[PDB]
Amino acid sequence: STQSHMFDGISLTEHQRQQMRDLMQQARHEQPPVNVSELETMHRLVTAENFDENAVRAQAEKMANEQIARQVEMAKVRNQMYRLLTPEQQAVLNEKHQQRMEQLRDVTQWQ
Amino acid sequence: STQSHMFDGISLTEHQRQQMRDLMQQARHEQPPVNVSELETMHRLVTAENFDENAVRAQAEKMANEQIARQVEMAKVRNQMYRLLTPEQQAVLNEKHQQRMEQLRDVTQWQ
């Protein structure tokens, strides 16, 4: 996947916005589509006559290596987009991230 | 996460729906909430003054191991749910899965 909240609500110059569009366009180009064959293999394990948790774990491990590759490459592109921002925009972005994380620690927001 | 399309559109008896609700509520109970501290660690890596791809990869590996544990446990629960279905319902479920995967191999559905 490529969707992120990281840059939500940041006010960009036109030049910043264009560069970020370009960076994301190429990141997408390089990220392969969903590995449908791995989904099918996992489905056939989950529906097997004899459920094989070892086989399931091995298949999850195999799938996670693709996920790691995506996460690393997207971290790189997002770092690059971050480096186009001014110190002031970076500070806004970091504050928004802090407030977003606080939602995951604030029980009253889920009651 | 716990959401899945696996059982979409399957007509269940009341006793099946009840058991599947119970199985999912327990699976949820056992699945810890989002590891906010690891999101924070990754965000600090992505916004570091000197971006460190090795550290990002190590962090993605760590997070991936948690994802593996979730996926294996969810596979077990989903196999248990599948085992409550009749052969007829299983055949419907498998045909629906096949049709869903075909969407990922059919360019005309995305044009």
UniProtKB/Swiss-Prot annotation, chains A, B:
Task: Explain the consequences of disrupting this gene.
Answer: Hypersensitive to alkaline pH (greater than pH 8.8). Increased accumulation and toxicity of overexpressed, misfolded periplasmic proteins.
Effect on the protein of changing M20T: No longer inhibits Cpx pathway, protein more susceptible to DegP
User: Annotated Gene Ontology MF terms?
Assistant: identical protein binding; unfolded protein binding
Instruction: Give the UniProt keywords, A-Z.
Output: Periplasm, Signal, Stress response
Job description of the protein: Acts as an auxiliary protein in the Cpx two-component envelope stress response system, helping modulate the Cpx response systems response to some inducers. Binds the periplasmic domain of sensor histidine kinase CpxA, inhibiting induction of the Cpx envelope stress response in the absence of inducer; overexpression decreases Cpx pathway activity. Some periplasmic stimulii (shown for P pili subunit PapE and probably 0.3 M NaCl) increase CpxP's susceptibility to DegP, leading to CpxP degradation, inducing the Cpx pathway. Aids in combating extracytoplasmic protein-mediated toxicity.
State whether it acts alone or in a complex, and with which partners, per the record: Homodimer; it might alter shape slightly at pH 8.0 when Cpx is induced. Binds the periplasmic sensor domain of CpxA. Interaction with CpxA is not seen in vivo when cells are grown in 0.3 M NaCl, or if the misfolded P pili protein PapE is overexpressed.
Please state what the protein is called.
Periplasmic protein CpxP
Say which species the protein is native to: Escherichia coli (strain K12)
Q: Which residues of the full protein are shown?
A: 40 to 150 of 166
